[PDB]
């Protein structure tokens, strides 16, 4: 029951069978048969050990993590602050790494359910996973084993002052 | 160094000044410490008579166990004494001399400028 519009699941459009022609039902004794055999042995056990886990509730609860001035407020040095800062950026780095996990995912997902068409329907899934991609490889990509914060912002530092030059050859 | 501090009353171990520090709390890791090298002493002395070890140390280890927690108590209190009057007299001198020592502004890293070669 995971939450859908994040991971999209289109139209199922199934089609309707047609025999079109008098022949045996080959597969269709053992679909049913199977659906007799392995559907509801199973399905009493799963219901039964669902009552089971009902008849006493547990609530287990996704954390949370406030806000902090991060990187800028901080002095030069007095690590007293630095320390949330930096872990907490942190903290947020391996989130935007799941989120390129979930794009990536969501492109894989997409020529499987398109089949032969695979430049027909992931033109619009595969462009925004460019975008975020392109967004995490300008961010964090290379900086090396370490890194906390003073070296991405650093490296901010470096693309705005590249991008200052370059747009005064803007002008 | 520091003998212009105590060479006004020499030949003190330790003063009646050194009375507000706090002693050192039975149980303080080292002279506990100091009471196992007492320990070993006593061995190395029962291993050196070649009397098997273990044995005549019903007495002798508790000698050297407690002289060692005697003296090496003494020795942490003067020890922290030491330590008290250094720290005084840093921090006198400091307040005693503004300009010597500036107590700069730190700036946050909103100005900051470095080079941070990427891997690549
Ligand atoms: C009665 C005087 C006897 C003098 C001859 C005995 C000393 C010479 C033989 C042993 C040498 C020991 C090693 C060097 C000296 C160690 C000094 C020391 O720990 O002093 C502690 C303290 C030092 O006393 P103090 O700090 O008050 O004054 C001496 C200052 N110094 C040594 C730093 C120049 O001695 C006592 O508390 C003695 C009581
Ligand atoms: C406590 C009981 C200690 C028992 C000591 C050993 C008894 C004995 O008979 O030892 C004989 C042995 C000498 O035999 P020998 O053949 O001469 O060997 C010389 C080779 N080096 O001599 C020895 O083995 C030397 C003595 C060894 C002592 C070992 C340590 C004893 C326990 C204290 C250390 C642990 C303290 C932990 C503190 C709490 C944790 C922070």
Same mark, same amino acid.
């Given at each position: 029951?995971?939450?859908?519009?994040?991971?999209? *699941? =289109? =139209?199922?459009?199934? =089609?309707?069978? $047609?025999?079109?022609? $008098?022949? =045996?039902?080959?597969?269709?004794?053992?679909?049913?048969?199977?659906?007799?055999?392995?559907?509801?042995? !199973?399905?009493? !056990? /799963?219901?039964?050990?669902?009552?089971?886990?009902?008849?006493?509730?547990?609530?287990?609860?996704?954390?949370?993590? /406030? /806000?902090?001035?991060?990187?800028? *407020?901080?002095? *030069?040095?007095? !690590?007293?602050?630095?320390?949330?800062?930096?872990?907490?950026?942190?903290?947020?780095?391996?989130?935007?790494?799941?989120?390129?996990?979930?794009?990536?995912?969501?492109?894989?997902?997409?020529?499987?359910?398109?089949?032969? $068409?695979?430049?027909?329907?992931?033109?619009?899934?595969?462009?925004?996973?460019?975008?975020?991609?392109?967004?995490?490889?300008?961010?964090?990509?290379?900086?090396?084993?370490?890194? $906390?914060?003073?070296?991405?912002?650093?490296?901010?530092?470096? /693309?705005?002052?590249?991008?200052?030059?370059?747009?005064?050859?803007?002008? | 160094?520091?003998?212009?501090?105590? #060479?006004?009353?020499?030949?003190?171990?330790?003063?009646?000044?050194?009375?507000?520090?706090?002693?050192?709390?039975?149980?303080?890791?080292?002279? #506990?410490?100091?009471?196992?090298?007492?320990?070993?002493?006593?061995?190395? +002395?029962? #291993?050196?008579?070649?009397?098997?070890?273990?044995?005549?140390?019903?007495?002798?280890?508790?000698?050297?166990?407690?002289?060692?927690?005697?003296?090496?108590?003494?020795?942490?209190?003067?020890? +922290?004494?030491?330590?008290?009057?250094?720290?005084? +007299?840093?921090?006198?001198?400091?307040?005693?001399?503004?300009?010597?020592?500036?107590?700069? +502004?730190?700036?946050?890293?909103?100005?900051?400028?470095?080079?941070?070669?990427?891997?690549?």
């Amino acid at each position: 029951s995971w939450d859908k519009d994040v991971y999209p *699941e =289109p =139209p199922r459009r199934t =089609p309707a069978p $047609s025999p079109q022609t $008098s022949l =045996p039902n080959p597969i269709t004794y053992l679909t049913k048969a199977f659906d007799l055999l392995v559907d509801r042995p !199973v399905t009493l !056990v /799963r219901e039964f050990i669902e009552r089971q886990h009902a008849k006493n509730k547990y609530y287990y609860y996704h954390r949370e993590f /406030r /806000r902090v001035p991060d990187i800028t *407020e901080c002095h *030069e040095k007095d !690590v007293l602050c630095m320390f949330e800062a930096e872990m907490q950026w942190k903290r947020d780095y391996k989130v935007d790494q799941e989120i390129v996990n979930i794009i990536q995912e969501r492109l894989k997902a997409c020529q499987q359910r398109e089949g032969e $068409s695979h430049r027909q329907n992931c033109a619009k899934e595969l462009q925004q996973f460019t975008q975020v991609v392109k967004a995490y490889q300008d961010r964090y990509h290379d900086l090396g084993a370490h890194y $906390s914060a003073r070296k991405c912002l650093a490296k901010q530092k470096q /693309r705005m002052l590249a991008e200052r030059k370059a747009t005064k050859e803007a002008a | 160094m520091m003998t212009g501090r105590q #060479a006004r009353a020499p030949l003190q171990f330790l003063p009646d000044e050194a009375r507000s520090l706090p002693p050192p709390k039975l149980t303080d890791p080292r002279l #506990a410490y100091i009471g196992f090298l007492g320990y070993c002493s006593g061995l190395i +002395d029962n #291993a050196i008579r070649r009397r098997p070890v273990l044995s005549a140390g019903l007495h002798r280890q508790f000698l050297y166990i407690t002289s060692f927690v005697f003296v090496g108590y003494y020795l942490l209190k003067r020890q +922290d004494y030491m330590y008290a009057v250094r720290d005084h +007299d840093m921090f006198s001198y400091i307040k005693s001399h503004p300009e010597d020592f500036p107590e700069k +502004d730190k700036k946050t890293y909103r100005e900051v400028f470095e080079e941070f070669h990427p891997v690549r």
